[PDB]
Design a protein around this ligand. Sequence first.
Ligand SMILES: Nc1ncnc2c1ncn2[C@@H]1O[C@H](COP(=O)(O)O)[C@@H](OP(=O)(O)O)[C@H]1O
Ligand SMILES: O=[N+]([O-])c1ccc(O)cc1
Ligand SMILES: O=[N+]([O-])c1ccc(O)cc1
Length: 288
Amino acid sequence: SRPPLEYVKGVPLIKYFAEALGPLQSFQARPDDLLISTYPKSGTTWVSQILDMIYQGGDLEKCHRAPIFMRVPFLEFKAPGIPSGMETLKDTPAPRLLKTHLPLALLPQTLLDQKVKVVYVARNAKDVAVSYYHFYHMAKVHPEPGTWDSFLEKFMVGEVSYGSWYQHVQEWWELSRTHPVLYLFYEDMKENPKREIQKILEFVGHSLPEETVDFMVQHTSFKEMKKNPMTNYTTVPQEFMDHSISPFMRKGMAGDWKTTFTVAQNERFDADYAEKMAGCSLSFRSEL
Ligand SMILES: Nc1ncnc2c1ncn2[C@@H]1O[C@H](COP(=O)(O)O)[C@@H](OP(=O)(O)O)[C@H]1O
Ligand SMILES: O=[N+]([O-])c1ccc(O)cc1
Ligand SMILES: O=[N+]([O-])c1ccc(O)cc1
């Protein structure tokens, strides 16, 4: 319970996830796999539901066949008493949708060699930090988060599960120049979901009638996903995730960080951010 992070090749990982890397070395990617890649709390569950819906031709019934974590295997996942992502993967039929938060230094090479299409979702760092803080509390495999004040400090130096948010969004952005990567922003999806869903459709090469897309926009909205047991993570063991501490589907808004960050924290964070993101062409929106 609340085991400390294990550092692997410069990356701090949840203890059990680090152990999962051994068997992951046997993983073989297929040319038709699709990898959903994100830094934690950036919209992974959201885009995963959208992608599965597209794969099921928009059939909402087919999507309820099992919870999202079973439909989209989480590659490096492992926890006591729960099957590993590698185990779930064995029973997953192609074409497969795969999930990971692994930085490139740990990503299985097979995925890059097979030229697997990647859907990457990035979210502004301030909302990510607030979302991650609460997640740390409810998802018990993480170490104690401490106070918000101390967590923010750890976040800024990358001393949190999966490491630096700054390194993560930048390296995957760079990868998009030489690998098939659709780079999305959570805020864009929030602003106009239909527009982003259309971009995903064109990327994966599928075509769906407008009526079906409108239908998808409605069923992948925050309100709908928060109530759907196949996407809100409420069916997992309480010892693993305690929704009474904080729900997985917490708020689902862009700009929520403003009610948690104090002015002093905002000034310090912005000055640090300017340095770390100096030479990057990435541009994030913190509100709207
Ligand atoms: N359909 C939806 N619309 C918007 N936000 C969504 C969403 N489904 C989940 N989210 C939000 O995405 C975050 C979790 O991302 P991930 O799946 O990568 O862990 C949470 O953010 P909040 O904690 O800010 O609410 C969650 O509420
Ligand atoms: O990622 N998760 O939280 C999971 C993944 C797989 C599982 O069987 C249960 C929970
Ligand atoms: O620690 N956990 O249980 C997690 C961590 C990341 C994630 O995307 C899902 C579940």
